[PDB]
Design an enzyme around this catalytic site. Structure first.
Site, PDB file in Angstrom:
ATOM      1  N   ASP A 186     -38.626   9.461-106.545  1.00  0.00           N
ATOM      2  CA  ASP A 186     -37.530   9.568-105.582  1.00  0.00           C
ATOM      3  C   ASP A 186     -36.192   9.823-106.194  1.00  0.00           C
ATOM      4  O   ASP A 186     -35.902   9.219-107.225  1.00  0.00           O
ATOM      5  CB  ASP A 186     -37.583   8.288-104.594  1.00  0.00           C
TER       6      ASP A 186
ATOM      7  N   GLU B 221     -38.644  14.389-106.924  1.00  0.00           N
ATOM      8  CA  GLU B 221     -37.893  14.845-105.758  1.00  0.00           C
ATOM      9  C   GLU B 221     -36.533  15.335-106.226  1.00  0.00           C
ATOM     10  O   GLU B 221     -35.658  14.540-106.565  1.00  0.00           O
ATOM     11  CB  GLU B 221     -37.700  13.749-104.719  1.00  0.00           C
TER      12      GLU B 221
HETATM   13  C1  LIG Z   1     -35.444   9.051-101.425  1.00  0.00           C
HETATM   14  C2  LIG Z   1     -34.305   8.150-101.502  1.00  0.00           C
HETATM   15  O1  LIG Z   1     -33.712   8.410-102.702  1.00  0.00           O
HETATM   16  C3  LIG Z   1     -33.367   8.325-100.476  1.00  0.00           C
HETATM   17  C4  LIG Z   1     -32.118   7.483-100.702  1.00  0.00           C
HETATM   18  O2  LIG Z   1     -32.379   6.276-100.755  1.00  0.00           O
HETATM   19  C5  LIG Z   1     -33.937   8.097 -99.240  1.00  0.00           C
HETATM   20  O3  LIG Z   1     -32.919   8.195 -98.224  1.00  0.00           O
HETATM   21  C6  LIG Z   1     -32.987   7.345 -97.094  1.00  0.00           C
HETATM   22  O4  LIG Z   1     -32.667   6.034 -97.374  1.00  0.00           O
HETATM   23  C7  LIG Z   1     -31.405   5.809 -97.592  1.00  0.00           C
HETATM   24  C8  LIG Z   1     -31.219   4.395 -98.022  1.00  0.00           C
HETATM   25  O5  LIG Z   1     -31.731   3.460 -97.035  1.00  0.00           O
HETATM   26  C9  LIG Z   1     -30.607   6.118 -96.436  1.00  0.00           C
HETATM   27  O6  LIG Z   1     -29.289   5.840 -96.650  1.00  0.00           O
HETATM   28  C10 LIG Z   1     -30.778   7.468 -96.134  1.00  0.00           C
HETATM   29  O7  LIG Z   1     -30.075   7.798 -94.949  1.00  0.00           O
HETATM   30  C11 LIG Z   1     -32.144   7.763 -95.978  1.00  0.00           C
HETATM   31  O8  LIG Z   1     -32.273   9.079 -95.712  1.00  0.00           O
HETATM   32  C12 LIG Z   1     -35.018   9.061 -99.073  1.00  0.00           C
HETATM   33  O9  LIG Z   1     -35.775   8.871 -97.996  1.00  0.00           O
HETATM   34  C13 LIG Z   1     -35.955   9.019-100.175  1.00  0.00           C
HETATM   35  O10 LIG Z   1     -36.846  10.080 -99.964  1.00  0.00           O
HETATM   36 CL   LIG Z   2     -40.507  14.659-101.103  1.00  0.00          CL
END
Ligand SMILES: *[C@@H]1[C@@H](O)[C@H](CO)[C@@H](O[C@H]2O[C@H](CO)[C@@H](O)[C@H](O)[C@H]2O)[C@H](O)[C@H]1O
Ligand SMILES: [Cl-]
Ligand SMILES: [Ca+2]
Length: 496
Positions: free
Chosen positions: A197, A233
């Protein structure tokens, strides 16, 4: 790190987004193994913040509190049970590794976490790891806010907080070692690899140093010296200094241009059309095929998160989505991931979904079981795209044609196209506003073939369309623009 470590002849993974471990274990045994799926991407299995405003959003799982294997999907015993049962039927598990960051810096301190561990974001105290203030990038980040402000500065993208998420000091051996301790726990349990991630937010060399600490895969199931599959990612849509190629020495990368462009083509935006797909792959500006993890949509961008993109096709666009997934699964570029989703009450205001935070189907925050209906669809608001006939049969198509070249391309200069995979499969698409009726060279041996989109081969017969291939390899195809699914696919194992 580049090989998926699936069984020979299994060529896709499915993202069972927010599924519980017990349900994945059962799914491995009752469906994924018999239908030829290579493996499962699981939601983050480590303890995260329990967020109640809004109520238990899916995105709370991207805010770690510890590396205890203790989440709404289940506990460590349940996780191990799933990995063992899946590996025992030859279906691999890939972990979504959230290793760039801990939780938001403004989350309140306490025990509002999925295993009840204490944490204090304001004091940088995560005692269940443990991490302290020495383990975060507060001092290294040079922005006025401490957050990422400008993606044209590749340094702050790595050293500052992604939307306030506390950013781990991945240069430090202590931090690298705590992450490797977590990942090696998972490898030794039997996981086959990882989605890393937020890899754009990590330096390539820090990722490499973490990967240098990892074990080979568990030798009860995998040959000696097998390296975990790594897919990073990295959202790279072309307009920023960070390029995903900087990460090729570590593993594969997510190719987000793939679904973005396939969506614009299939929606026919800006004059794009399927005839342009003849040179799909690196000719479209994509990473090398052997470094690509491809997908139509992912859990972020199906709901406008991540980099989003209005062009992304999802299960809500079922007819066009099946076509896009079918094209992806037939085409040799990349290693394919199929999405498997849940339904939520999507509600657009001024072009944006105000319910894009809603978490998985639940009763008072407890994730619901996946129920299986007599027709093999799912209940309890699980979409189960991977069980749609048109998608499952294309997962099988990809297995059947594995290794065969892209050949016998046809197009009408608009949106009627076809191609083969050596002498093992052939697929035909009609995305024009008129019918497609034409005899095409298929490359296949003569015989009668079941179309695996409209039906199945069952007991020596076809339940849908039948295609008749002559001694010359040619066959007639007829697809109305009003067909339920305006594409036909046939392969060596659908021959009668
Ligand atoms: C990867 C991850 O790095 C992202 C960031 O954390 C994540 O994003 C989601 O979670 C965060 C934190 O809760 C939110 O602020 C974002 O709005 C949300 O999109 C990704 O889903 C992940 O793939
Ligand atoms: Cl992905
Ligand atoms: Ca970072």
């Amino acid at each position: 790190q580049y090989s998926p470590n699936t069984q020979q002849g299994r060529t896709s993974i499915v993202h069972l987004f927010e599924w519980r471990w017990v349900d994945i274990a059962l799914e491995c045994e009752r469906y994924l193994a018999p239908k030829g799926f290579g493996g499962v991407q699981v939601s983050p299995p480590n303890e995260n913040v329990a967020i109640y405003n809004p109520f238990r959003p899916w995105w709370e799982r991207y805010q770690p509190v510890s590396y205890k294997l203790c989440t709404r999907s289940g506990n460590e015993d349940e996780f191990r049970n799933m990995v063992t049962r899946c590996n025992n039927v030859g279906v691999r598990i890939y972990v979504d590794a959230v290793i760039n960051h801990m939780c938001g810096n403004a989350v309140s301190a306490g025990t509002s976490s999925t295993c009840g561990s204490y944490f204090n974001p304001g004091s940088r105290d995560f005692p269940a790891v443990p991490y302290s203030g020495w383990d975060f990038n507060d001092g290294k980040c040079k922005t006025g806010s401490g957050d990422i402000e400008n993606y044209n500065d590749a340094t702050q993208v790595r050293d500052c907080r992604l939307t306030g998420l506390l950013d781990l000091a991945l240069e430090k051996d202590y931090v690298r070692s705590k992450i490797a301790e977590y990942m090696n726990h998972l490898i030794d349990i039997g996981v086959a690899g990882f989605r890393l991630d937020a890899s754009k937010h990590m330096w390539p060399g820090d990722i490499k140093a973490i990967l240098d600490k990892l074990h080979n895969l568990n030798s009860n199931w995998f040959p000696a010296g097998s390296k975990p599959f790594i897919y990073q990612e990295v959202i790279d849509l072309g307009g920023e200094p960070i390029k995903s190629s900087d990460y090729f020495g570590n593993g594969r990368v997510t190719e987000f241009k793939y679904g973005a462009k396939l969506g614009t083509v299939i929606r026919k935006w800006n004059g794009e059309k399927m005839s342009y797909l003849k040179n799909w792959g690196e000719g479209w500006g994509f990473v090398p095929s052997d470094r690509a993890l491809v997908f139509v949509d992912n859990h972020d961008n199906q709901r406008g998160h991540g980099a989003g993109g209005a062009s992304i096709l999802t299960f809500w666009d079922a007819r066009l989505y099946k076509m896009a997934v079918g094209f992806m699964l037939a085409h040799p570029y990349g290693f394919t991931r199929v999405m498997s989703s849940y339904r939520w009450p999507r509600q657009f205001q001024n072009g944006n979904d105000v319910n894009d935070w809603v978490g998985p189907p639940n009763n008072n925050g407890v994730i619901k079981e996946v129920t299986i209906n007599p027709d093999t669809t799912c209940g309890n608001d699980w979409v189960c795209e991977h069980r749609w006939r048109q998608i499952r049969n294309m997962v099988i198509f990809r297995n059947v044609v594995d290794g065969q070249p892209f050949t016998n391309w046809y197009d009408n200069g608009s949106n009627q196209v076809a191609f083969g995979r050596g002498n093992r499969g052939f697929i035909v698409f009609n995305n024009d506003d008129w019918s497609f009726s034409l005899t095409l060279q298929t490359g296949l041996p003569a015989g009668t073939y079941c179309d695996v989109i409209s039906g199945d081969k069952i007991n020596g017969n076809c339940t849908g369309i039948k295609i008749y291939v002559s001694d010359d390899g040619k066959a007639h195809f007829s697809i109305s623009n009003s067909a339920e699914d305006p594409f036909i696919a046939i392969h060596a194992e659908s021959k009668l």
